[PDB]
Symmetry: D2
Subunit: 296 residues, 4 copies
């Protein structure tokens, strides 16, 4: 019973592969055609557009970079909504503006289908293993159905409320993360410059009120925690570019809902600075490197 | 074998009581005399100055508000250093500027005594139960001795390095808390205004990369968590005034060490505002009230 | 030769009046109908919708609050673009998102008309006297035509580039204004609290590298300058609500163009908080009153 | 009638030269001895310490980098106060912590001399020409005397109040400058990236509510204005190191007076970072370079 997948990059590729592990035939499409080559070999069908995915697939998933990509993929001249069938389940696991999710939801429900935002927590690793967290928004009746499908790609699938709530939950956590990580980087930098041994300061933080996931699970000072991007030149990880994108969404939503985010705004600008300054492909925890003094 | 205690407020009072529970005679002093009244009843000796505590006590503890108070309590005209005895152990568990800790350390070591900064993590509750964390700085040989004494008032006593490193650790930790608490607050306020139930957003933060002490142990959003100040109009707890003082210490250390603290600076200024806008006596998680429309 | 005017609030009312002073018949429309009553008395024609202004007016001006208002006024079910005539000149002097200006520009050009964003500098006063500055974007050949019309309402009309550049010019200015006003407020408060007389600190600021329009022309500290809003409890002036709206524009355009605006972002949030804390109707210079204890 | 001058760097050298232009014999000292070599050739006396300046000079001026330097130059083992004479006039035109100015003032007054803080506005250019602004604090009777002397080096000499008020004034002006300059840079960077022509955007800023000294006299965008550091790769001018120093003085005063400074703090932190990143030897207007992609 076929499943449609549109967009097969860093999260999409392994996500799409796990659906094949659980035994689903896929109808693939991607605007970068090289990205599909691997799937045509696996036995799966590659098509020429989103509309052509919809014409053959009763329920579809979309893992695209940002809002304009989803607007295009769905509403475009050769988009999904041009040939989506009655009662179809469309799931967008991209991270995009919630307002845009609702807009798409209105246009899908106009077509007699169901739409659900389902952005993801966890990176390329969790994507492969299948331990991603899905934050799901939409008509609650349909959540049962979506859980069946999303559970193949992920270990946690949480209902967040109406369409848009999934994006809002993703965006809020990333903002807190962004803030806490820059904070850890600063507390750590100040302490080291005050004479403390990083390993000990990190200990003190991690047993006190300062403790957070940044300090205890993703520590940005090299030589403190093994297994994290700081141990490995901040390679791979979750990309500064993406942190900045997600922060940018938080800024858009903060402004529109007239929500003051003092620390969040600055987190956004710091990451935006980092991207213009050669950190864009480095892990977001490399904010510590950015704070840390250069020699003369 | 007598122990000297100078400064008996919110942390000092219960700390001093726990030393009595483990069976130490106390030589009490406080510039606010009413604060002593309770101890003169318990059988303890109240004196007229710090110098007079030092004249009678071989090892002393000081729990004072900030730097100027410690500078006065020690170096003052009738301060400790006027009558401290050879080989005495002086411990300052105030949260003050590290630089000032070193300056006192130099003046104590001049007098042939030992000084150690030992600021505390945990609030009034931990103080009473005796589960405070002490972050201790000073000459490492002396740490053994200090652990013996501090362990009566606290459950964790950690060596941080040379004199000043304890204040360094307390100050830094409080900055991360402030940044994170305001962070959690901004995040929850955002999500609520985007139409999320707070109990569900907290769940998500807490099973995710956002998780931190502020969000999973001290949530600032009324009705999310039992047994926290947001459950009770932000009474008690750790006060905005004190938070703001501590972040001031961070700001000044950051300046002195030339360390960029962008968020830390905002955190400082936000709590300074709250002190001016009637939050001074509320718990610092009340920053969420301050952002909430 | 008729001129269409949509939206007659604080800037719109006096702008519309100055076009009557130079001798133009007006075709008025406003979603708040009481706002029109004054013009039906002057002899001018009030209509039921923007579309109905278009049906009667060869060149139209729109002075609306923000983006969605322009999007609706033009593209709406009974909007301008429903009945606009070949070769018409449409001028939007609202302050809105540049991106939205371009979008309307494409939609107007599709209908064989000309569109031009022409936001304004100067307040209600400049509006009345006719000394507003217009920042104008659009196809440069059409600038001559627009200057003829806008010059009735304003004393300076400057070409900024393609459609969107006017909004981008207004938005960047109001961002620098906001940053500098909060700066002046902060600097003055710091000096006052450091024991300076405010009038002296202003003298110094205004003869030195700190001088800016905020300090030498619109000074936020009551009693430093006569005739500025701070001399009359921040009544009238340029509204805190609108400044936040404009800073929201800067913010969202900074995001879209990936432009780091650190102080700018803070300015936005500070003004955001003021709206929620009882400054929304007060002049934007009231940030001083908001900082002061 | 001899004048003592201690510290002959970027401001000191030309200041000291203007005193020679008005015809004063100078008794020079500087911890960097090469800095003196030029004055030994002019006929002036170089000495081996501040104390040795005081032994020969009835009224002295000190143009040093920061607080510790003044503390040392005055109170040091071979400092001024070791051999200052009755009724002498000591003037410190360094930019330092006001609290430290008062401390010195008390120590000078104890020795029967007068002390006056007199920090300066205007850079290396105004220094040479003699158009610097002096902001003067101290006992008001003595202001007459100091004006006679300072007027040789500067065109404006303003009384600010008691000792420390000069520093107070310098420090709040510079904080406002930092905020506006970063503001301008942010404003200009955002306009450019929204596609404006810079020369135009500056024109608009400079005829609108955004206008300020930063944008109309010292515009950081290369090629908008002639004559400013941004025309010459940000060489010379007013160094990022010193701006960061002055904003550290604002910050520490801001904390000490419990004054909220959200933007001044950010300003401080930005300039801090720029010093960490090889902007230190560059004029402070180089903040535009730093934000720009
Ligand atoms: N990478 C991570 O560690 C991580 C973690 C959590 C969440 N996310 C979120 O997941 C989303 C995508 O992650 P990713 O790293 O796989 O992105 P990606 O860019 O690597 O993959 C997206 C793919 O979509 C394709 N695409 C773009 N527009 C399209 C269109 N109109 N039609 C068809 N295909 C199109 C691109 O060719 C690309 O291969 C983002 O929104 C991101 O915020 C990423
Ligand atoms: N309150 C908390 O939850 C908490 C937690 C950890 C650390 N701290 C830190 O511990 C320190 C004290 O906290 P607190 O709430 O007990 O303060 P407090 O005001 O409640 O207690 C201070 C006491 O010291 C006295 N005092 C002031 N100057 C004195 C002097 N010169 N000589 C003798 N006594 C003097 C005061 O009269 C008062 O009784 C602070 O530095 C604070 O930041 C507090
Ligand atoms: N007020 C000032 O001092 C000042 C100064 C310079 C620039 N501005 C800018 O001018 C713009 C508008 O200023 P204002 O004070 O006139 O705003 P305003 O709110 O006072 O007036 C706008 C009017 O438009 C009407 N309106 C709203 N939606 C409409 C619609 N869809 N169709 C037709 N009419 C509609 C409203 O009823 C209202 O009366 C803002 O973007 C602001 O930034 C204001
Ligand atoms: N540079 C400017 O455009 C400008 C403008 C206004 C105000 N200021 C203020 O002026 C002050 C100094 O300005 P500058 O640019 O000449 O600095 P500078 O570094 O060029 O000059 C300082 C001089 O004093 C000497 N010195 C340092 N410590 C000494 C000591 N203990 N005893 C004797 N000499 C000592 C140094 O060797 C140096 O020659 C600063 O405090 C700054 O904020 C500078």
């Amino acid at each position: 019973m076929p499943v449609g997948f549109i967009g097969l990059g860093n999260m999409g590729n392994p996500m799409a592969k796990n659906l094949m592990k659980h035994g689903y035939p896929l109808i693939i499409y991607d605007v970068f055609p090289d990205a599909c080559k691997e799937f045509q070999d696996a036995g799966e069908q590659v098509v020429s557009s989103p509309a052509d995915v919809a014409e053959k697939a009763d329920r579809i998933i979309t893992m695209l970079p940002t809002s304009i990509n989803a607007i295009e993929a769905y509403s475009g001249a050769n988009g999904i909504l041009k040939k989506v069938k009655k009662g179809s389940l469309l799931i967008d696991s991209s991270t995009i503006d919630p307002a845009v999710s609702k807009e798409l939801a209105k246009e899908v429900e106009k077509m007699g289908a169901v739409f659900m935002d389902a952005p993801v927590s966890g990176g390329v690793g969790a994507a492969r293993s299948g331990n991603l967290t899905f934050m799901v928004g939409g008509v609650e009746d349909e959540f049962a159905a979506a859980q069946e499908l999303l559970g193949c790609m992920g270990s946690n699938v949480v209902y967040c409320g109406a369409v848009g709530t999934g994006q809002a939950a993703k965006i809020c956590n990333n903002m807190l993360l962004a803030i806490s990580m820059i904070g850890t980087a600063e507390a750590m930098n100040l302490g080291i410059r005050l004479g403390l041994d990083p390993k000990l300061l990190a200990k003190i933080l991690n047993m006190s009120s300062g403790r957070c996931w940044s300090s205890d699970t993703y520590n940005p000072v090299p030589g403190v925690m093994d297994g994290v991007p700081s141990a490995n030149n901040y390679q791979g990880g979750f990309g500064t570019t993406l942190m900045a994108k997600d922060l940018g969404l938080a800024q858009d939503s903060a402004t529109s809902t007239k929500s003051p985010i003092l620390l969040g705004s600055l987190a956004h600008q710091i990451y935006r600075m980092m991207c213009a300054k050669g950190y864009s492909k480095k892990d977001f925890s490399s904010v510590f490197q950015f704070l840390r003094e250069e020699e003369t």
